[PDB]
Design a protein around this nucleic acid. Structure first.
Ligand SMILES: [Cl-]
Ligand SMILES: [Cl-]
Ligand SMILES: [Cl-]
Ligand SMILES: [Cl-]
Ligand SMILES: [Mn+2]
Ligand SMILES: [Mn+2]
Ligand SMILES: [Mn+2]
Ligand SMILES: [Mn+2]
Ligand SMILES: [Mn+2]
Ligand SMILES: [Mn+2]
Ligand SMILES: [Mn+2]
Ligand SMILES: [Mn+2]
Ligand SMILES: [Mn+2]
Ligand SMILES: [Mn+2]
Ligand SMILES: [Mn+2]
Lengths: 108, 95, 84, 99, 93, 105, 97, 78
DNA sequence: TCAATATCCACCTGCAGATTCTACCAAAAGTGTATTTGGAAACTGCTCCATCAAAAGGCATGTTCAGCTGAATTCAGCTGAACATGCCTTTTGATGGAGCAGTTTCCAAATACACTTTTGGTAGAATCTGCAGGTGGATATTGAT
DNA sequence: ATCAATATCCACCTGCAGATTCTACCAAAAGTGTATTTGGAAACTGCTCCATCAAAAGGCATGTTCAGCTGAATTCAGCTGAACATGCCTTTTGATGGAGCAGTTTCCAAATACACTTTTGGTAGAATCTGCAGGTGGATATTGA
């Protein structure tokens, strides 16, 4: 037969179109799943993890570190309005809190 | 033996090199990344699901995943997500 | 196993003060410590109860970290870092 | 004539310190007993994945830390600077935890 | 067309506790929202439970566990009772 | 011959609950007693609200349960109030209550 | 020529309104407002009279609930007058801000 | 047009809330909040609308939207 | 306390809008058979949780002391409630008509299936380094005077 | 302003606890061919939903008075932070025995399919009914003198 190309590659994505498609089926969401449902969902997940790794990896550089860790992921998220609102009720293990001190608390 | 267990680690990593070639992700950090991917998948999948149900439709097409995405994500984050989704799809269907 | 009792004092005044600091608290009243232990008590109870239910329903004698995660998400406190 | 930081200066130092770190702040063992005590008071002969006791501490500290922020917001609103039980209860009430 | 609801049943259960009492339609509206909601909560929780436990089927076992996690201490007791009872009976007939 | 509801000794559509549990993508396969059990629980809570609501009505020398009566029924009961704390009952109004510091003299 | 002292009628109004349940915003204005924002999202829409009612109920509930948390904040500050500080404070603890 | 939401009504709302004394700035403050509320919910409903390819926002579209905002409403379908 | 102005609370009274009530049909909800399969037993491989031992020092615990809060008062400037007015925007009902949710079929395209080959992942090895934890030496802050 | 006492900040090391890169099966994607099923889709059709009037109150917008509420300013008892001495007990490191998850295989009670066979629940009209809402009449509750 023909050489096996992956839906991911057909889509120009890094995330697993095949795996996402299965998770959709086996996940009991709808009864039937369109072909471009896994392609679109992966693309979005791939876009989002890229938007936060870009921000996270910078937090990492700003700290002389070459290896992203949770702190970096926190500062990445909690500083970007968009991402913070999105994960506004999620808590990141080992991520700490953002350096912030009410003014009325500083010496005068 | 010690049955294998799927993850999103591989792709998080690929994407990492795509934006920060020299940067590496620790382990706990990758631990978060999965939670996130899973978490957001679940949110989208569900609304997508819920949406189909509301409309007496038995299938979740990419169109479901899209509305889902606009309700879930905010501001630009959503706009960019859709641009990317749509793109990645027509490219797929476009042969 | 020896009997477990009054462990809520394990949460020392030193500790609770530390927490308040990361919470950006300058001055701490004297009653804050016992109030905090009270709040923590309930928080734990509520989260353990739910986690331990997810365990029992699985015919298990071990509370897996996942039980706690499912427990927390039900409670509206989604945690990242153990979920996988 | 020993040196002496005016009251409130070490606090700020401690705030600036702890917000920069991410280490847990309650002692591990004391906290593991509290989990085990509370747990066994629901069901006996229970066991915990190490990972699970951690998931809980990360959760509690995360919660108490964040509660204190709202609590500080309340004290401050009272033209005060010292958090007092009033504050925690007002935060939790508005928080919708237990009104 | 047809648009089913719990109305009859609500009203049926109503007369068993207050045969003397009636019910505004607006009230009947609120009663459905209620049943639909709780129905959705329990069902959804039961759905997850099976998944966490990699089970292909949602049994009254999930529906119970689901009710404990979902209903306030005392309410849960009774609900679990009524549910266990209502099954034990059904099943022995 | 006999409906599962009448068999389960229930006033709720066991058959219907069953159809829905199946329809609303929850599981792949649905046990045979889940539709019963669930319908039992649903009925219970319904009867639970109706009595407290009907009692709220009798105290208003009214014989028909309106939303007010369902709101006063719920907000006045710890259990029902907690279970419905993030739900708003249209035309329910609010429990009369005035903070002390706001009273005369 | 009689006159009630400041705050008395106010309490009366409190007692009168916590007792009733009629919506407190004039229907028309509200509907006009709903439709105005709606236009900004999708044009030339229609509205089930019941969907408008749904919104006004939800909205009025929200506002009232918020006025409660607000008042409690004003009392915390040892006042009896709710001011922007309070709605602000409350909304932040609620996590809407 | 939001100005249409009169001082008096904002006054009534607060009263049911148990408020005894209103600050002059409370009014413009309330309208802002009220707007942000209607904007977030209306936007959500209309998305559900547009999805069903309709040109009419139904009460269910609000209810569903409202449930997404954690503002569950009882009495219009669920 | 006495006296007067409004409020509130009752017991009725009587339409008017809703509500129970009185009949009938497709869509479900039982039945009877046949088929298929999930997940309960039993068993066993093996991870990893509970324990115990010991040594070391990071910290929690108590105590002294006094800076500077929070809690009281007092005071009056002026923000906001109670009102009497003046008039216009909202409430209420009918039309009348157009847009349009909701069906109703056709059926070409899109999914689900069955299963057969093909590889991309995942689980340990083998191979590597970012940086934790130390150490000094500037630099920057605080707080006394 | 000026030191003098500390605490903070930055760069320089470098072994190793974890992160990368290898390697090697096999669980599950991707390919194909072959039955369903979905849900756009061109017409059509009774609702619903805007529009338009078109008056009538209410109900809201104003401009007044002044009651009393919120800040501002001043005080000061003593609560709560800082600094220290003392030594408890959490941490760290490891090693072990089994309690129990988990991975495999059997299959029988139980759930799913299908084909029909009856029973219901929803949909329209058909007969009441419960309050809303208006009406005295009688104490209440306020508030001024
Ligand atoms: Cl699709
Ligand atoms: Cl207090
Ligand atoms: Cl079952
Ligand atoms: Cl303000
Ligand atoms: Mn880049
Ligand atoms: Mn099987
Ligand atoms: Mn000691
Ligand atoms: Mn002193
Ligand atoms: Mn002060
Ligand atoms: Mn004055
Ligand atoms: Mn390969
Ligand atoms: Mn370092
Ligand atoms: Mn064993
Ligand atoms: Mn019938
Ligand atoms: Mn009346």
């Amino acid at each position: 037969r023909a050489k096996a190309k992956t839906r991911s590659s057909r889509a120009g994505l890094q995330f697993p179109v095949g795996r996402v498609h299965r998770l959709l089926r086996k996940g009991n969401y709808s009864e039937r799943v369109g072909a471009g449902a896994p392609v679109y969902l992966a693309a979005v997940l791939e876009y989002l993890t890229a938007e936060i790794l870009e921000l996270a990896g910078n937090a990492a550089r700003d700290n002389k570190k070459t290896r992203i860790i949770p702190r970096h992921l926190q500062l990445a998220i909690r500083n970007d309005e968009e991402l913070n609102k999105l994960l506004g009720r999620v808590t990141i293990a080992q991520g700490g809190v953002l350096p912030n001190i009410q003014a009325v608390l500083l010496p005068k | 033996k010690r049955s294998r267990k799927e993850s999103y680690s591989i792709y998080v990593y690929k994407v990492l090199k795509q934006v920060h070639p020299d940067t590496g992700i620790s382990s706990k950090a990758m631990g978060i990344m999965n939670s996130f991917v899973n978490d957001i998948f679940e949110r989208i999948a569900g609304e997508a699901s819920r949406l189909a149900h509301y409309n007496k439709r038995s299938t979740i097409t990419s169109r479901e995943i899209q509305t889902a995405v606009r309700l879930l994500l905010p501001g630009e984050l959503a706009k960019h997500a859709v641009s990317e989704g749509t793109k990645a799809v027509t490219k797929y269907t476009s042969a | 196993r020896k009997v477990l009792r009054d462990n809520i004092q394990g949460i020392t005044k030193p500790a609770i003060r530390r927490l308040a600091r990361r919470g950006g608290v300058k001055r701490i009243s004297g009653l804050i410590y016992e109030e905090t232990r009270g709040v923590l008590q309930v928080f734990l109870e509520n989260v353990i109860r739910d986690a331990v239910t997810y365990t029992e329903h699985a015919k298990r004698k071990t509370v897996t970290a996942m039980d706690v995660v499912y427990a927390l998400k039900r409670q509206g406190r989604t945690l990242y870092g153990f979920g996988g | 004539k020993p040196h002496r930081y005016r009251p409130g200066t070490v606090a700020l130092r401690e705030i600036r310190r702890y917000q920069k770190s991410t280490e847990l702040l309650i002692r591990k063992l004391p906290f593991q007993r509290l989990v085990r005590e509370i747990a066994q008071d629901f069901k006996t002969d229970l066991r915990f994945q190490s990972s699970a006791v951690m998931a809980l501490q990360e959760a509690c500290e995360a919660y108490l830390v964040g509660l204190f922020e709202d609590t500080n917001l309340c004290a401050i609103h009272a033209k005060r600077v010292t958090i007092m039980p009033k504050d925690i209860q007002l935060a939790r009430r508005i928080r919708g935890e237990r009104a």
